[PDB]
Amino acid sequence: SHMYLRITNIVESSFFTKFIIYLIVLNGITMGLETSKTFMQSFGVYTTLFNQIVITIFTIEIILRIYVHRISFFKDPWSLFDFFVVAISLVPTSSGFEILRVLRVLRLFRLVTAVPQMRKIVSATISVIPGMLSVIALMTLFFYIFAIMATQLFGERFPEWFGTLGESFYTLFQVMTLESWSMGIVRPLMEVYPYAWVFFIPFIFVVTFVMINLVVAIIVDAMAILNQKEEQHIIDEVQS
Amino acid sequence: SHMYLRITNIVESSFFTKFIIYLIVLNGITMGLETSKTFMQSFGVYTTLFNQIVITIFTIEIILRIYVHRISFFKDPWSLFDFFVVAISLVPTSSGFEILRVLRVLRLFRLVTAVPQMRKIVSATISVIPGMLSVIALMTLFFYIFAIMATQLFGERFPEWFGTLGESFYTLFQVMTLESWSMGIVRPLMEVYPYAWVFFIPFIFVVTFVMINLVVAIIVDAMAILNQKEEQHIIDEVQS
Amino acid sequence: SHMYLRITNIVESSFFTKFIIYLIVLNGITMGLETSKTFMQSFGVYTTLFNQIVITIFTIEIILRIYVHRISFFKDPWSLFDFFVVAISLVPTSSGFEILRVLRVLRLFRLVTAVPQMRKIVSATISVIPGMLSVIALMTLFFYIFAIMATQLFGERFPEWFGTLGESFYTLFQVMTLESWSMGIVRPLMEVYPYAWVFFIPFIFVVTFVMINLVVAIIVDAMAILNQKEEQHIIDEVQS
Amino acid sequence: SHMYLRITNIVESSFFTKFIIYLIVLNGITMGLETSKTFMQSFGVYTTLFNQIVITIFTIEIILRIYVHRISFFKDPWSLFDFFVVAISLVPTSSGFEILRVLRVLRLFRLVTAVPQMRKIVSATISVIPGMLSVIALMTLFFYIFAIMATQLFGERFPEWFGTLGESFYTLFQVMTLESWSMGIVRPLMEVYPYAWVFFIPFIFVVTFVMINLVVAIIVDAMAILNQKEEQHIIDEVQS
Ligand SMILES: CCCCCCCCCCCCCC(=O)OC[C@H](COP(=O)(O)OCC[N+](C)(C)C)OC(=O)CCCCCCCCCCCCC
Ligand SMILES: CCCCCCCCCCCCCC(=O)OC[C@H](COP(=O)(O)OCC[N+](C)(C)C)OC(=O)CCCCCCCCCCCCC
Ligand SMILES: CCCCCCCCCCCCCC(=O)OC[C@H](COP(=O)(O)OCC[N+](C)(C)C)OC(=O)CCCCCCCCCCCCC
Ligand SMILES: CCCCCCCCCCCCCC(=O)OC[C@H](COP(=O)(O)OCC[N+](C)(C)C)OC(=O)CCCCCCCCCCCCC
Ligand SMILES: CCCCCCCCCCCCCC(=O)OC[C@H](COP(=O)(O)OCC[N+](C)(C)C)OC(=O)CCCCCCCCCCCCC
Ligand SMILES: CCCCCCCCCCCCCC(=O)OC[C@H](COP(=O)(O)OCC[N+](C)(C)C)OC(=O)CCCCCCCCCCCCC
Ligand SMILES: CCCCCCCCCCCCCC(=O)OC[C@H](COP(=O)(O)OCC[N+](C)(C)C)OC(=O)CCCCCCCCCCCCC
Ligand SMILES: CCCCCCCCCCCCCC(=O)OC[C@H](COP(=O)(O)OCC[N+](C)(C)C)OC(=O)CCCCCCCCCCCCC
Numbered sequence: 034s035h036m037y038l039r040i041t042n043i044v045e046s047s048f049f050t051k052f053i054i055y056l057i058v059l060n061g062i063t064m065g066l067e068t069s070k071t072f073m074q075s076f077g078v079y080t081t082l083f084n085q086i087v088i089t090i091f092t093i094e095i096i097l098r099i100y101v102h103r104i105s106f107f108k109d110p111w112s113l114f115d116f117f118v119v120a121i122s123l124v125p126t127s128s129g130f131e132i133l134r135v136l137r138v139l140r141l142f143r144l145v146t147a148v149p150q151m152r153k154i155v156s157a158t159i160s161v162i163p164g165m166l167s168v169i170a171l172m173t174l175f176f177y178i179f180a181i182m183a184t185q186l187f188g189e190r191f192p193e194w195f196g197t198l199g200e201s202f203y204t205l206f207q208v209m210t211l212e213s214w215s216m217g218i219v220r221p222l223m224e225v226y227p228y229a230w231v232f233f234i235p236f237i238f239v240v241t242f243v244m245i246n247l248v249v250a251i252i253v254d255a256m257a258i259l260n261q262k263e264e265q266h267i268i269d270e271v272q273s
Numbered sequence: 274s275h276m277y278l279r280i281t282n283i284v285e286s287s288f289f290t291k292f293i294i295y296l297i298v299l300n301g302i303t304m305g306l307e308t309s310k311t312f313m314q315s316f317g318v319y320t321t322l323f324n325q326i327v328i329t330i331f332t333i334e335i336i337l338r339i340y341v342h343r344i345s346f347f348k349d350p351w352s353l354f355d356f357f358v359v360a361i362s363l364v365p366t367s368s369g370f371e372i373l374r375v376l377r378v379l380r381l382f383r384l385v386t387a388v389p390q391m392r393k394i395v396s397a398t399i400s401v402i403p404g405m406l407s408v409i410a411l412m413t414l415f416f417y418i419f420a421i422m423a424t425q426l427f428g429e430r431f432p433e434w435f436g437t438l439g440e441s442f443y444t445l446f447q448v449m450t451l452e453s454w455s456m457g458i459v460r461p462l463m464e465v466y467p468y469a470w471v472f473f474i475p476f477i478f479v480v481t482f483v484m485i486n487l488v489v490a491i492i493v494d495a496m497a498i499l500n501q502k503e504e505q506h507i508i509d510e511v512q513s
Numbered sequence: 514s515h516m517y518l519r520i521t522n523i524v525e526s527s528f529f530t531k532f533i534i535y536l537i538v539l540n541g542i543t544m545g546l547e548t549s550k551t552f553m554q555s556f557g558v559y560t561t562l563f564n565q566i567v568i569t570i571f572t573i574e575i576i577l578r579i580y581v582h583r584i585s586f587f588k589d590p591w592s593l594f595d596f597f598v599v600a601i602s603l604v605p606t607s608s609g610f611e612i613l614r615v616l617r618v619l620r621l622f623r624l625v626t627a628v629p630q631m632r633k634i635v636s637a638t639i640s641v642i643p644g645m646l647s648v649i650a651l652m653t654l655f656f657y658i659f660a661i662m663a664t665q666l667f668g669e670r671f672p673e674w675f676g677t678l679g680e681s682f683y684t685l686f687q688v689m690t691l692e693s694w695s696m697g698i699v700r701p702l703m704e705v706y707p708y709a710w711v712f713f714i715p716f717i718f719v720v721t722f723v724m725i726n727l728v729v730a731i732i733v734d735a736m737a738i739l740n741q742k743e744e745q746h747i748i749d750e751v752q753s
Numbered sequence: 754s755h756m757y758l759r760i761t762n763i764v765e766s767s768f769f770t771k772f773i774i775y776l777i778v779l780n781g782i783t784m785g786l787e788t789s790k791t792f793m794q795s796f797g798v799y800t801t802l803f804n805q806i807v808i809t810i811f812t813i814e815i816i817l818r819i820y821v822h823r824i825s826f827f828k829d830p831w832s833l834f835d836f837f838v839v840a841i842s843l844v845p846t847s848s849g850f851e852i853l854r855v856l857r858v859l860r861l862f863r864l865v866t867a868v869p870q871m872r873k874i875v876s877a878t879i880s881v882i883p884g885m886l887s888v889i890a891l892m893t894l895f896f897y898i899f900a901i902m903a904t905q906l907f908g909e910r911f912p913e914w915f916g917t918l919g920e921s922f923y924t925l926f927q928v929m930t931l932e933s934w935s936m937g938i939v940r941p942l943m944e945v946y947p948y949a950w951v952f953f954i955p956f957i958f959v960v961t962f963v964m965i966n967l968v969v970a971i972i973v974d975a976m977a978i979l980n981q982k983e984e985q986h987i988i989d990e991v992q993s
Contacts, residue, residue: 065657068664068678135665141658150647158726167390177305178381184308185375198308203710207695210717215447216457217696232444237450245488246398248725253495255733256976261502263740266986270751271510405868417785420863424788425855442884455927456937470923477930485968486878493975496736500983507747511990545897548918615905618986630887632759638966649885683950687935689955728965733836743980750991 037100044094045102050147051096060087064138079219084137091119091140111146118142161251169246172240176205179236186232190225194218207239208233277340284334284341290387293334297384300327304378324377331359331380351386358382401491408487412480416445419476426472430465434458448473449480517580524574524581530627533574537624539566544618564617571599571620598622602617641731648727652720656685659716666712670705674698688713689720757820764814764821770867777864780807784858804857811839811860831866838862882932888967892960896925899956906952910945914938928953928972930961 043049063080066072073080095116099106106112121136145151180201187195194204208214214233222229303320306312311319329337335356339346339462346352361376387390420441427435448454454473463471523529543560546552553560573597579586586592601616625631658680667675674684688694692715702709764771783800786792793800815836819826826832841856865871900921907915914924928934934953942949 061657064661065678068661135662138658138661138665141654141661144654145651151651154651156646157730158723161726161729168394171394172393173386174381174384177301178378181304181308181381182376183377184493185378198305203695206714210691211450211452211692212691212694213453213696215443216453234446243398246401248729249488249492249495250397251399252492252729252732253499255729256496256736257499259733259737259740260499263744264503264506266744267507267747267751268510270748271507271991321757408874411865411871411874414861414864417781418858421784421788421858421861422855425858438785451930451932454930454932455923456933474926483878486881488973489881489968489972490877492972496976497979500979504983506987507987508990511751511987541897544901545918548901615902618898618901618905621894624894625891631891634891637970638963639843641966641969663775683935686954690931692931692933692934693936728969732969732972735969736976739977739980743984746984747987747991750758750988 040097041101044097049094053091054144054147056087057141057147058092060084061141061144064141087140088119088122091143095119111152115143115146162249165247168243172243175239176202179232180205183232184208187222187226189230191222205236208236211237280337284337289334293331294384294387297381297387300324301381303383304381307393319443327380328362331383332363335359351392355383355386371401404491405487405513407485412483415479416442419472420445423472427462427469431462445476448476451477453467520577521581524577529574533571534624534627536567536570537621537627540564541621541624544621567620568599568602571623573604575599591632595623644731645727648723652723655719656682659712660685663712667702667706667709671702676680685716688716691717754946761815761886764817768812772869773811775860775865776810777867780804780860781864784861791864808839808842811863812843815839831872835863835866839947884971885967888963895959896922899952900925903952907942907946907949911942925956928956931957 039173046237060083063083067077067080080171098112098115102109102112108267121133124133126134145155180198183195183201183205184198188197188201193200195201204218208218214237219229219233300323303323307317307320314334315477327374338352338355342349346356358379362380364373380387385395423435423441424438428437428441433440433482435441442457448458454477459469459473462473519621540563543563547557547560578592578595582592586596598619601613602620604613606614625635660678663675663681663685664678666679668681673680675681684698688698694717697708699713702713766786780803783803787797787800818832818835822829822832826836838859841853842860844853865875900918903915903921903925904918908917909919913920915921924938928938934957939949939953942953
């Protein structure tokens with residue numbers, strides 16, 4: 034169309050994306066400065082104004098991008114993100130609760146969706162997850178079973194660490210990271226339950242063994258593929 | 274046979290295994306809910322009844338599976354597991370001791386033996402163990418020798434950490450994870466035994482060096498095999 | 514030239530570099546001895562004299578090397594280093610501030626730039642950095658966004674850990690290393706902000722997931738290259 | 754010879770080595786039992802007698818092995834070990850100091866030198882060290898320089914952690930393991946030296962970066978070799 038293609042050339046323009054990026058880095062520096070009560074005392078009204086300025090400009094940009102991109106926009110996770118991040122930034126400050134005033138900062142993550150060198154890393158990193166889903170499932174089932182057992186064995190005398198299923202989940206994650214697992218948790222438990230080490234040490238083994246096996250399997254299964262491609266390429270040349 | 278083959282078609286049926294799985298996930302949600310004293314106050318008799326219901330249904334299922342599978346059942350580790358897990362769930366609640374009431378929760382692990390996507394992970398993970406057996410042996414002998422030495426050097430002034438061979442084992446495992454090894458253990462020791470760092474730092478080196486070498490050897494010995502298969506496949510095509 | 518080539522033969526001589534190295538190891542032993550107040554009480558004037566002796570000899574050496582090497586000297590990072598390290602050692606002790614008296618010790622790092630077996634390690638190690646620059650950028654942006662969020666959510670009640678953007682950076686690095694992350698930080702926070710675990714646990718996941726992915730990608734992308742070289746070498750022989 | 758070859762057939766016999774191993778496992782169980790004051794009260798004279806029994810039998814065995822093996826014995830590290838371990842076990846209990854009574858336990862390590870499945874692991878593990886020697890050198894030089902700097906910056910106000918070069922070495926190793934590095938060390942320092950984080954965080958980076966690079970280089974340099982062998986094997990078949 035003609036009215037359509039006018040917009041589409043702006044949105045798709047390098048000036049557009051850059052101008053957005055410069056806003057982001059500008060609002061980024063602003064949100065770090067808003068951290069200083071000294072600064073907010075002096076210049077606090079400027080950056081509050083600079084904020085919705087950026088908010089609306091981002092709202093407009095989001096709208097245009099939807100007009101240009103159509104349904105392809107709501108099937109693009111980076112666009113979907115930019116949508117919700119700017120959406121969050123839109124519910125009213127006063128009428129809301131404080132937690133939404135803080136989530137405003139997530140708009141700074143647009144610097145990731147904008148800069149393509151950044152998307153690729155996030156994609157690389159996230160790419161390995163879908164193969165781990167069954168492992169994540171198993172690990173969670175594991176935590177679950179042990180959290181139920183812990184809550185029953187230790188919650189009555191140790192409510193802070195194990196009084197509820199949720200609390201026991203948390204402590205077991207703590208033990209998985211090994212943070213103060215022994216001086217902070219098991220040694221105290223053992224003053225009342227001498228055999229507690231029979232619970233947590235195997236827990237520490239399974240959790241540790243599994244995670245390591247995950248990394249070895251990721252590394253070693255990848256090179257098997259590299260060898261598969263290499264093998265066939267070399268086999269082809271032999272074959273002609 | 275005819276009486277035999279009637280059963281065998283049910284046990285081997287997809288409806289069967291699914292129905293078991295649905296029970297498991299149902300008893301799983303029940304065992305998490307039984308964690309709440311609020312819930313047990315209100316609905317506590319329902320889930321206690323739902324429990325032996327599931328217990329007997331699992332008992333029956335275990336029996337049928339033995340009739341169908343014969344001696345092949347007691348040579349299958351997944352079946353052997355499901356056996357003992359359901360067995361444990363069968364000794365009486367009142368007459369027993371509390372620890373068996375908790376082991377009941379292990380039946381939730383049937384969701385692993387049932388779901389084949391899960392078995393494969395556990396098999397993958399456990400597969401690497403038999404090659405490590407001599408390394409596990411060496412590490413244990415190592416802990417053993419050092420536990421005897423620690424108990425003798427430090428148990429008299431530090432009975433909580435080193436009074437007995439069992440306690441010294443435990444502290445040495447703690448030091449292996451590095452959890453509070455220095456502020457919590459060696460620094461206190463050194464107020465009385467200034468040279469204690471000569472004991473634990475080499476301990477921290479050997480233990481650490483060995484474990485890392487275990488992971489490198491696992492990764493690197495695997496790709497040697499991948500290269501062996503690849504080499505011969507490629508060598509064959511060259512050979513014809 | 515003739516005056517030039519006289520010097521150039523000394524600087525480039527094996528005796529030269531060795532003599533410098535022997536000074537370095539000598540000043541190294543001296544700087545460790547200067548650590549003892551007993552020793553400084555007895556022999557403190559000797560090593561203070563031995564110090565500027567070495568300082569000037571290193572100054573002279575640096576000058577000669579610049580005469581010999583010309584502009585190639587200021588394009589060589591090892592020389593540039595040796596320059597600034599000896600430069601630092603030159604500002605006056607009395608008139609300065611204590612921190613420059615300590616930076617004097619960095620001259621001991623010349624033993625690295627001197628010994629070529631050492632340079633190669635540092636080069637190997639530093640070689641992998643330029644590919645990580647965008648990952649370092651992303652991680653820093655990440656810390657930044659979360660530091661702003663933390664300062665806002667937790668600084669008012671927890672000023673030591675989160676009162677300022679700088680402090681929150683520091684605590685988040687602490688949490689990244691996992692050092693006392695739960696007993697020391699999140700558990701205290703949760704007495705006032707029960708949902709704080711929703712902040713730090715995802716933080717602990719992203720940070721951990723990313724770093725691991727960095728190591729796997731480094732290992733696995735390298736062997737892809739090794740396979741590329743190997744593939745073509747083998748493909749060539751097939752091709753003739 | 755004839756007197757020689759009589760002995761040589763015993764020493765080299767499978768019965769010999771086994772009999773030694775059975776002693777070792779027997780003295781091993783004895784040294785764990787000697788740990789119990791209950792047991793030493795009851796059966797303490799038996800195991801003290803069983804001890805020099807084993808000591809002399811091991812002395813004799815060591816002698817025979819030297820007669821049989823000649824100078825080849827003192828060029829064999831496993832034999833050299835068994836020598837010194839049994840030697841240590843020989844200096845007198847009463848006249849000595851307690852530390853030699855404890856080193857007696859090292860004889861249990863003969864179970865490693867005896868069992869060949871064990872030697873191979875220790876050899877594998879130790880095999881990777883000689884390539885790391887220059888890296889170990891660099892890391893130690895690094896600790897050294899930073900230990901001198903720490904002692905000067907922080908020893909006067911923090912003598913326990915940094916009063917001497919030896920103490921600062923120890924704390925820096927603690928920081929390398931990250932054990933309580935921040936709550937236990939840097940945070941206290943920063944109450945007096947706000948910029949202390951500029952010292953330890955880069956320290957934590959270098960130390961961490963180097964060690965990781967060591968593991969990646971070990972893994973990745975090994976597969977380069979595997980590819981080299983594979984490449985030439987495959988290239989040969991192409992060549993005929
Ligand atoms: C090897 C790779 C995988 C490694 C991880 C395996 C999965 C296990 C992760 C567990 C994480 C810890 C969860 C946690 O913090 O538990 C707390 C929550 C909420 O209970 P709540 O009582 O509100 O929290 C404690 C509140 N308190 C202390 C102030 C009274 O307790 C709950 O009710 C939450 C339980 C569900 C958590 C689901 C996590 C799924 C995995 C996350 C996705 C991973 C993708 C990479
Ligand atoms: C065998 C496989 C089965 C899979 C089942 C997965 C789903 C499990 C659902 C059951 C959740 C049970 C939660 C529960 O009992 O909550 C306990 C507490 C509340 O305790 P309560 O005493 O009710 O608090 C009273 C509070 N008052 C006085 C103010 C009224 O609240 C909490 O502690 C927080 C709730 C924690 C939920 C953790 C969810 C873990 C998901 C695991 C997923 C496994 C995937 C394979
Ligand atoms: C690099 C890979 C391998 C890494 C691990 C190497 C093997 C060493 C693991 C040692 C684990 C720690 C053992 C432990 O907790 O020791 C405590 C037990 C029981 O003594 P007890 O006095 O009852 O416990 C202390 C009681 N207290 C403090 C309340 C007075 O002390 C004992 O008497 C138990 C001693 C035998 C433990 C056997 C462990 C064998 C390895 C486990 C299988 C690994 C398969 C992956
Ligand atoms: C050179 C290779 C030799 C291999 C030998 C392996 C087997 C070792 C068996 C010897 C175990 C000795 C155990 C021992 O002495 O127990 C000490 C304490 C009990 O102290 P005690 O003073 O008797 O307690 C009195 C209690 N009272 C007052 C109520 C009567 O009880 C404890 O502290 C718990 C017992 C700890 C046992 C740890 C087992 C480690 C196995 C290492 C396997 C190495 C494989 C290569
Ligand atoms: C996976 C690989 C990458 C892993 C690391 C990712 C990057 C994040 C590293 C963050 C390091 C922690 C920074 C830190 O210590 O923050 C403190 C500083 C100074 O603020 P200040 O308020 O002076 O410090 C606290 C003072 N106090 C507590 C006594 C009141 O706060 C600041 O203002 C400093 C903020 C900028 C730090 C820039 C770091 C860039 C990365 C370093 C280069 C890496 C090359 C390998
Ligand atoms: C979306 C991407 C945007 C990228 C922007 C990167 C640059 C950010 C610049 C903004 C820095 C804001 C610093 C700031 O607000 O400082 C707060 C505090 C000072 O608080 P204040 O209350 O002013 O202290 C008063 C002291 N008195 C009473 C003696 C006068 O001072 C501190 O806490 C120390 C300053 C911390 C600086 C941390 C720098 C992080 C760099 C991140 C780089 C990201 C790269 C992609
Ligand atoms: C990435 C791979 C390599 C990783 C390690 C790199 C090398 C650095 C390791 C440093 C280990 C820590 C040394 C240590 O504990 O320092 C203490 C000693 C003795 O000083 P002292 O004042 O007696 O000890 C403190 C006594 N106090 C607290 C009770 C008053 O201080 C000293 O004077 C000892 C200084 C020399 C230690 C030499 C260590 C060389 C490396 C070990 C061999 C590695 C082979 C795998
Ligand atoms: C640039 C490369 C140069 C390489 C040089 C390597 C060798 C260094 C030798 C210098 C060692 C200096 C040791 C030193 O000053 O000791 C300080 C303290 C003793 O303090 P002090 O105040 O004398 O104690 C008086 C005690 N009283 C009252 C009872 C008489 O004693 C201690 O704190 C313990 C001694 C610590 C020694 C640490 C050795 C590290 C070796 C690093 C190897 C690097 C290899 C590349």
